Design a protein around this ligand. Structure first.
Ligand SMILES: CN[C@](CCCC[B-](O)(O)O)(CCN1CCCCC1)C(=O)O
Ligand SMILES: CN[C@](CCCC[B-](O)(O)O)(CCN1CCCCC1)C(=O)O
Ligand SMILES: CN[C@](CCCC[B-](O)(O)O)(CCN1CCCCC1)C(=O)O
Ligand SMILES: [Mn+2]
Ligand SMILES: [Mn+2]
Ligand SMILES: [Mn+2]
Ligand SMILES: [Mn+2]
Ligand SMILES: [Mn+2]
Ligand SMILES: [Mn+2]
Lengths: 306, 306, 306
C-alpha cells in the first residue's frame, strides 16, 4: 500500500495569516514516521510552491484572491491526479479548505466515480452569490457539485473545473455552523449530512454505518475524505481559523477515521485548516498538529486495540 | 413570538455573594441580540428591584432570609403572571434558584396545567425540616408540590404561597448531588428524574423522549423550563455556587434545549445560578455567561444545523 | 461490611520515580473518611515496607528488578490473603501495576474462583519474552493466566507464583495502547476485552452488562477489580506514568464502579499507577488523587442519586 504526501501551504482561500504553516506543523508532529510504521510505502512531494497571479483583484468586490485560488488549485489538481494515477492514496496537508477544489478535481480526474466524506463544523457550500465573507474556503463544495452549477457564476481562474460529482455522492459529518443559504442548499438538493445533533442522537457508530450505506451501499467506490480539523471541539483543536464550540470528541474523530480505513476504499485524504499561528501557546499548536497526525494515521490503519 | 425578559438579581436564597450579578453577565454575553436574531419580539423588564425586609432574622435558627425570599418571590410572581397573561413567553434571569418559587407561582396563575422540566445537578426539594444548609435555593420545589404540603412548615413571608403543581408534573434532568432526605422524597412521592447515571445509560435523546412522554404524552401542556447552570459540568460552567463534577456536556445541554423548543410548548424559562464573582478568571465568568445565552437561545429555536 | 486498606508503595515494576507516593496521595485526598461515610468498617494496614533484594540484576539483560518485584508481591500476597480470610473486601493502593501479581495471588488463595475486571488503557499481558520495555508493570497478567504458562519463563523471585486463573476469567475495559504481541495473545487465547472503540460503539452500559454476562452470567463469583488510573483520559488523570489520549470520561469511570458495586460481589480492588510526581502542578496531582478516591468510593456504594 502506497501513500503520497503533498504539502499545500494554501492561505488565500481566507483572510487569517498562518494556515500556510499547517503542512510543516503536521510533518513536525511526526506524520511520515507514523505512516511508515503502519506499513505505508511513502512518496513525499514536499510542500508545493504555487504560481502567483498579478493584480488578483476582488471578484464582484467581494470574493478574495479568485485567480490565485483558481490557479493554485489547478496546479494542485495536476500533482494529485498524477499521484493517484501512479497508484498512491493521496494525502494533502493544508492550508485552507479551498484546496479541496484542487484535490477533489485531481482525484476525480483519475477516479471519476469517487465519493466524498466531508468532516467539518461547516458545509463549505456557499456559492459566490451567497457567501457573506468572500472567503473561498467556505465555498469549495459549490464548485464541485454537478447539480449546483446553474447557480454558480464563472470566477476568473476557475474555467478549468469540471464539476461532475453528484450531490448524492457527498456526506457531511460534524456540522454545527451552517449559513442560512447553505441550509437552503443542503435541503433543496437533498444533500445528506449528520450534524452534531444527529451524532448526539444516533451515536458515531450508526452515523458511520449510514454514511457508508448512502455512498457505497450499492457499489464499491474510491473514497475521498476531506477533513477540516475544526470538526473537532476547539478544546482539542484550538489552532484553527473558525473554531465552533460543541464539536467531535477525540474518540469520535478516531472512530470516523477507523471506519474510513475499514472500508478498504480510502483513495485520497485532505487534512486542512491547521493554523499554528492561532494557538495561544506552543502547546495548543502542537496538540492540534498531533491530532491531525492521529486522524491521518487512523485513516490508514492505526487502531486502538493494537 | 413575543418573549419577556426579566432580570431577577436574587441572592438571599443562599450565602455566596455575586449571584445577583448573573442577569447582567448574561445580558453582557449578548442575550438580547441573540433572541432578536431568532425572530423574537422582545419586552425587556430590566433588572427588578425587590423590596427589602428589615431584620429578616433566621427562621428556626437555620432558615436564611425567609421574609426576603418570600417577598421577592411574591413580587416576581406578579411580574411573571402579568407578562404571561399579556402573551409573553417569560425568560427570568437569576439570581439564585429560590426565584423559581416566584416564576412557577406566577406562571401557574394563568397556566394551571403547566408542567416543569427541572435541569439541575440538584433536586432542590429539601423542606425547611430537612435542609442541612438553611439555604432556600435548595428548597424551592418543596413549596410548589401539592403532595408535600403537609410536610412543609409555614415560613414567615411565605403565606401567599399555594402549592401549584402535582409531583407527577415535574421531571428532573441532570441529578448528581442529592441529599438523603431529598432521595427519600423523590422515591416516596414517585417523582420522576433522570440522573447523570440515567443519561449515561439511556443517552440524552431517550431521556428527552421519556421526559415528554411523562409530561405531555396524553395532552399538550405549557412547559416551564427551570434551568440551573450547574447542571453543566464545572469545566463548562465554573462560575456557579455549587459546582459538582460529572455534569452535562455542552452538546447534551444544547440537545435538551432544542427538544424543549421542538415541542412548541415552552411558556416560561428560568436560567439561574450564574455567579460571575466565583470565576477565577474573567474568561471563566464569560464562558459561563456565554453558555447561559446558548441555552436560552436554543430553547427558543437556535439550531446547530442552521 | 468491612474494608481493608493496604498501601503498597511499589515502584520497581517500572522506571519512573514517584509512583511509590501514590498511596499517600490517595489517602490525603480523603479516602478513609469517604469510605467510613458510606458505612464501611475500616481496617488500615498502613503502607507496607517491602523487603529489598541486594544485587537484583536484570534478568536476561532486560527485565528490571525481578527479585524485588517477586518478593514484594510474595509479601503483599500474604497480607491480602490474611485480610480476605478475615472477611474484608481488600483495597490495595499502588504503586505500579506489578502489584496485581501479589493482590490477585493472595486473593485467589481463599477465593480461587474469583474473576477479574481489569480497567486500564493497557492489557499488561506482555510476557518476559514479548516485553520491549522490561517493565514488570506491563507484564503482570502473563504470570496469572494458566493457559499462558508454557510461554512464560521462570523469573528469579517468581517461583512462588502459581498461575491462578483462566483466560476466560478476566475481562478488560478501556484498552487503547496494546503492543502487537499482546494483541496476538488476546486473540490467540480468546481473552475478552472492550477497547475504547468498543465503548464508543456499545456505550458503557452495554459494556458492563456484557462483562458481567461473560464472568458471572452463570454463577456468582468474587470480583477482583484491578483499576489502573490511566484508564481515564489524561485530561482527568494526568498524574500517571503512561498516559494515553482518548480515555474513559469521568462519568464512564463512575458508571463502571457503580456497576461493580451493584453486583454485590466486589471482594478486592486495586487502584494503581497514581504518580503525583508526574503532575505539572499541585492541582494536577490532587485531581488525579481525587479521581482515585471517587473510583474507590463508587466501587463501595457512592451513588450519584443520593
Ligand atoms: C459557514 N460560513 C463561513 C465559514 C467558512 C469556514 C470554512 B471552512 O473550511 O473552515 O469549513 C462563515 C460565515 N459566517 C461568519 C460569521 C458571521 C456569519 C457568517 C464563511 O466564511 O463562508
Ligand atoms: C443538595 N442540597 C444543597 C445544595 C442546594 C443547591 C441549590 B441549587 O439551586 O444550586 O440547585 C447542599 C447540601 N449540602 C449537604 C452536604 C454538605 C454540602 C451540601 C443544599 O444546600 O440544600
Ligand atoms: C503497553 N506496554 C507497555 C506499557 C505498560 C503500561 C503498564 B500499566 O500498568 O500502566 O498499564 C509499553 C510498550 N511500549 C511499546 C512501544 C513504545 C512505547 C510503549 C510496556 O512497557 O510493556
Ligand atoms: Mn470548517
Ligand atoms: Mn472546511
Ligand atoms: Mn443546582
Ligand atoms: Mn437549582
Ligand atoms: Mn495502564
Ligand atoms: Mn496497568
Amino acid at each position: 500500500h502506497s501513500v503520497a504526501v503533498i504539502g499545500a501551504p494554501f492561505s488565500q482561500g481566507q483572510k487569517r495569516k498562518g494556515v500556510e504553516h499547517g503542512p510543516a506543523a503536521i510533518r513536525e508532529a511526526g506524520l511520515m514516521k507514523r505512516l511508515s510504521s503502519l506499513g505505508c510505502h511513502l512518496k513525499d512531494f514536499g510542500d508545493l510552491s504555487f504560481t502567483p497571479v498579478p493584480k488578483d483583484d476582488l471578484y464582484n468586490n467581494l470574493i478574495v484572491n479568485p485567480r490565485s485560488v483558481g490557479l493554485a488549485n489547478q496546479e494542485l489538481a495536476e500533482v494529485v491526479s498524477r499521484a493517484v494515477s501512479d497508484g498512491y492514496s493521496c494525502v494533502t496537508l493544508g492550508g485552507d479548505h479551498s484546496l479541496a477544489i484542487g484535490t477533489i478535481s485531481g482525484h476525480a480526474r483519475h477516479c471519476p466515480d469517487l465519493c466524498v466524506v466531508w468532516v467539518d463544523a461547516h458545509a463549505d457550500i456557499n456559492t459566490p452569490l451567497t457567501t457573506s465573507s468572500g472567503n473561498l474556503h467556505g465555498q469549495p463544495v459549490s464548485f464541485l457539485l454537478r447539480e449546483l452549477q446553474d447557480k454558480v457564476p464563472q470566477l476568473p481562474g476557475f474555467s478549468w473545473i469540471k464539476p461532475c460529482i453528484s450531490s448524492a455522492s457527498i456526506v457531511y459529518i460534524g456540522l454545527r455552523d451552517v449559513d442560512p443559504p447553505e441550509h437552503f442548499i443542503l435541503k433543496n438538493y437533498d444533500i445528506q449530512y449528520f450534524s452534531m445533533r444527529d451524532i448526539d442522537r444516533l451515536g458515531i457508530q450508526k452515523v458511520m454505518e449510514r454514511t457508508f450505506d448512502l455512498l457505497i451501499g450499492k457499489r464499491q467506490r474510491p473514497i475521498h475524505l476531506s477533513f477540516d480539523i475544526d470538526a473537532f471541539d476547539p478544546t482539542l483543536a484550538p489552532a484553527t481559523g473558525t473554531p465552533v464550540v460543541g464539536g467531535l470528541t477525540y474518540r469520535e474523530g478516531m472512530y470516523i477515521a477507523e471506519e474510513i480505513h475499514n472500508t478498504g476504499l480510502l483513495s485520497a485524504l485532505d487534512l486542512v485548516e491547521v493554523n499554528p499561528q492561532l494557538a495561544t501557546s506552543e502547546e495548543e499548536a502542537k496538540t492540534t498538529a498531533n491530532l491531525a497526525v492521529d486522524v491521518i494515521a487512523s485513516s490508514f490503519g492505526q487502531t486502538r486495540e493494537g
